[PDB]
From a paper:
[name] binds a heterodimeric histone H3-H4 complex through its conserved N-terminal domain (aa 1–155) and impedes the formation of the (H3-H4)2 tetramer both inside the nucleus and in the cytoplasm. In vitro studies showed that an N-terminal of human [name] (aa 63–154) binds histone H3 directly through a conserved motif.
The N-terminal domain of human [name] (aa 63–154), the globular domain of [name] (aa 1–157) and full-length human histones H3 and H4 were expressed in E. coli. The H3-H4 heterodimer is centrally located in the quaternary complex, enclosed on one side by [name] and the opposite side by [name]. [name] is composed of an N-terminal tail followed by a short helix (α1), which is connected to a C-terminal helix (α2) via a long loop. The long loop snakes through the convex surface of the H3-H4 dimer, accounting for ~2/3 of the interaction surface area with H3-H4. This segment of [name] would bump into α2 of [name] if it took the conformation of that in the ternary [name]-H3-H4 complex. Finally, although scarce, direct interactions between [name] and [name] are observed in the quaternary complex: the guanidine group of Arg118 of [name] forms a hydrogen bond with the hydroxyl group of Asn152 of [name]; and weaker interactions between Gln104 and Asn152 of [name] and Arg118 and Glu111 of [name], respectively. Therefore, [name] appears to have a chaperoning function outside the context of a helicase complex, which functions exclusively in the nucleus.
Author numbering:
A (entry chain K): 26 to 101
B (entry chain J): 51 to 134
C (entry chain L): 68 to 123
D (entry chain I): 2 to 154
The structure:
């Protein structure tokens, strides 16, 4: 999964509020995002097939993201 | 009053991300096109998902009175969100 | 201890690279044509087919 | 989403470690419910394995009238014997999960800070954790509310 880089991981962590990272964070973050992307894509692509299309829409992804589960910090 | 200067933010680079999407999507279904807004939605998802994951890792560290975050704090962040 | 994430070189990570900072044309849609959104029936037909794998 | 949790309130917090968990759950129902809602309270003993998670209680609710309902969930404290020493003192999680037809639609998680309330014990904690001097502090205003889109039939 060479798409995501060490600089990228750092950028994400800094917006997260992080101050220091273990060396093992880079290998770990990659594994996590590999799973996350494989899952959302797999579903979005199935959605595209079931609509009899070969062009993936934002709504295909929007629907696949509702399936994976979205989190919020607090209630509504 | 204080005025803010505006600027796009940089988490993950776009072109590498698009190539990553193509890689994975190829294994599920060959000869398959993406709308730009779809790939972007996929990126926005990943980026906010990982940023939130790190926010948990940050909060775990501050209360546990640590400086360095560990893969275990990511594992916890993943757990509280449902995945095994 | 681990890797420090703030200091001399913070700006090194946030340099603009216009050659990577934009999406490639290839792999994307050809035109801006209208494209059908899934009907509620196809949405369900999909979600059932997806629950299939989950089981194995 | 046919059932939607509006709120969860943490009742005795902070508290002694051994104190039973007290939550006040407010959920909303768009129509009457054919099946039962199952609420689980789960204490994650260790981030390393699911083996160490302790289901502290499980409650079955039904039949459910339409509208805003409110109840108080109270589970006993986890067994300190099953908690890996490394994780005992410091940050861990409690989960409140609800399932419909055995499908989880909502997970409300809380980060839990276990810490000794004495300076001397903080300066030098014991090799084996002393649970009777531990304070349990659920980080209540920082919940991780995750919603999943499931089949409602």
């Amino acid at each position: 999964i060479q798409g995501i880089t060490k600089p990228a991981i750092r950028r994400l962590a800094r917006r997260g509020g992080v101050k220091r990272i273990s060396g093992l964070i880079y290998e770990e973050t990659r594994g996590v995002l590999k799973v996350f992307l494989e899952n959302v894509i797999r579903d979005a692509v199935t959605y595209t097939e079931h609509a009899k299309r070969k062009t993936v829409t934002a709504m295909d992804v929007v629907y696949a993201l509702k399936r994976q589960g979205r989190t919020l910090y607090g209630f509504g | 009053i204080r005025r803010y200067q505006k600027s796009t933010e940089l988490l993950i680079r776009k072109l590498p991300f698009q190539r990553l999407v193509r890689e994975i999507a190829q294994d599920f279904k060959t000869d398959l096109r993406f709308q730009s807004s779809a790939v972007m939605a996929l990126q926005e998802a990943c980026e906010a998902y990982l940023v939130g994951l790190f926010e948990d890792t940050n909060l775990c560290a501050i209360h546990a009175k640590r400086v360095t975050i560990m893969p275990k704090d990511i594992q916890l962040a993943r757990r509280i969100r449902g995945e095994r | 201890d681990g890797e420090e994430l703030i200091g001399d070189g913070m700006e090194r990570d946030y340099r603009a690279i216009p050659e990577l900072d934009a999406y490639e044309a290839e792999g994307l849609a050809l035109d801006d044509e209208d494209v059908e959104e899934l009907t509620a029936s196809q949405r369900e037909a999909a979600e059932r087919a997806m629950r299939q794998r989950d089981r194995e | 989403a046919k059932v939607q949790v509006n709120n969860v309130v943490v009742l005795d917090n902070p508290s002694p470690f051994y104190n039973p968990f007290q939550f006040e759950i407010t959920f909303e129902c768009i129509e009457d419910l054919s099946e039962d809602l199952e609420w689980k309270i789960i204490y994650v003993g260790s981030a390393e394995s699911e083996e160490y998670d302790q289901v502290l209680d499980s409650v079955l609710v039904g039949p459910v009238p339409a509208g805003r309902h409110m109840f108080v969930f109270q589970a006993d404290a986890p067994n300190p014997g099953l908690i890996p020493d490394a994780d005992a003192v410091g940050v861990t999680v409690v989960l409140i999960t609800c399932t419909y037809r055995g499908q989880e639609f909502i997970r409300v998680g809380y980060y839990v800070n276990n810490e000794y309330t004495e300076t001397e014990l903080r300066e030098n904690p014991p090799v084996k954790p002393d649970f009777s001097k531990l304070q349990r502090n659920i980080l209540a205003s920082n919940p991780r509310v995750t919603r999943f889109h499931i089949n409602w039939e």
